[PDB]
Design a protein around this ligand. Structure first.
Ligand SMILES: O=C(NC[C@H]1O[C@H](CCO)CC[C@@H]1O)Nc1ccccc1
Length: 339
């Protein structure tokens, strides 16, 4: 419909203006009080902070420049910040400030107190098909938006989907997101969610996001992923065979959609045919979905997370609390000039 075409043309106009003139240096560390570590990895952390003058809460992602260089993530971290400051969509976490200092890179995002979908899925066991469908529709619309901007996301998994105060999704972690006209080649992502053409070291495209959507829908509805095994190399063998067994409680319509998303031949995979995303939106499994109502956030959610207020951390787990050091000397200044 022309209304969808004009929505996506305006979305691309607004993205390109910010993409071509990125914002820089819009706060500093001592404008915030540190509260709690919410997550930690090999080159960065995410901490709950409070802004000292306004009182507002944020999630502050802190990346150690020297560790980013050693793990060969320079280009990826520059991608992440330039994309996040240019996008705008209901189901994407919002970047409010960014800055850098002698030691670290900082991205300050809105705080989402409901926690990760991963926690709720493991607590409940599995989601009913209507519950899984509500979350899946939000991911279909978000990928339609990102792909129209020539962006590939490349890190879909339940840990990266936060649940907000209305029970809707906010997608976080753009560490592997990239603007790609054509193909790209980097090996990245989590093993259970990787498409076959990534495992086989091929030039790949946006079709890898539609494969990962098939993995996510299967995991939401079954409680475990389709290609499960104990070591990555065993997971990879199952993925390139693409032999998928479905639980008997799955509906016939769910099995049919998953066979077309978990298609090993990328030239036959739903999302990557002539009709694009509309082969997914018009599939029988989505026949009860009101796409406009989801976008407008007018549908009542299946589940509202339990929390006490905008500073509550009870839906995140506990980590050792480490210093945020800032060296007296500048580190890696050249490499991060554009940040
Ligand atoms: O963004 C969020 N988590 C993303 C990842 O960040 C770290 C990676 C450092 O390189 C550690 C692992 C974590 O899964 N949380 C987050 C974001 C916004 C609001 C509330 C929570």
């Amino acid at each position: 419909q022309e209304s969808v075409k004009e929505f996506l043309a305006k979305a691309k106009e607004e993205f390109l203006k910010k993409w071509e003139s990125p914002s820089q240096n819009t706060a500093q560390l001592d404008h915030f009080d540190r509260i709690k570590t919410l997550g930690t990895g090999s080159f960065g952390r995410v901490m709950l902070v409070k802004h000292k003058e306004t009182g507002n809460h944020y999630a502050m992602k802190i990346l150690d420049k020297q560790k980013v260089v050693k793990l060969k993530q320079i280009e990826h971290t520059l991608n992440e910040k330039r994309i996040l400051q240019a996008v705008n969509f209901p189901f994407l976490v919002k970047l409010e400030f960014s800055f850098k200092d002698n030691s670290n890179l900082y991205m300050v995002m809105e705080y989402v107190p409901g926690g990760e979908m991963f926690s709720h899925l493991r607590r409940i066991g599995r989601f009913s098909e209507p519950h899984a469908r509500f979350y899946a529709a939000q991911i279909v619309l978000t990928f339609e938006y990102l792909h129209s901007l020539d962006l590939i996301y490349r890190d879909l998994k339940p840990e990266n989907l936060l649940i907000d105060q209305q029970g809707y999704i906010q997608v976080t972690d753009f560490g592997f997101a990239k603007r790609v006209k054509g193909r790209t080649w980097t090996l990245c992502g989590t093993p259970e969610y990787l498409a076959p053409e990534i495992i086989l070291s091929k030039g790949y495209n946006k079709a890898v996001d539609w494969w990962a959507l098939g993995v996510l829908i299967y995991e939401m509805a079954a409680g475990y992923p389709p290609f499960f095994a104990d070591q990555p190399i065993q997971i990879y063998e199952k993925i390139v065979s693409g032999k998928v067994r479905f639980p008997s409680h799955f509906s016939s319509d769910l099995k049919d959609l998953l066979r077309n998303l978990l298609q090993v031949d990328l030239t036959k995979r739903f999302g990557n045919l002539k009709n694009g995303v509309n082969d997914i939106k018009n599939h029988k499994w989505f026949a009860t979905t009101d796409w406009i109502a989801i976008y407008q956030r007018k549908v009542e959610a299946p589940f509202i997370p339990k929390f006490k207020g905008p500073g509550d951390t009870s839906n995140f787990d506990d980590y050792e609390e480490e210093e945020i050091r800032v060296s007296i000397n500048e580190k890696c200044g050249k490499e991060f000039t554009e940040f």
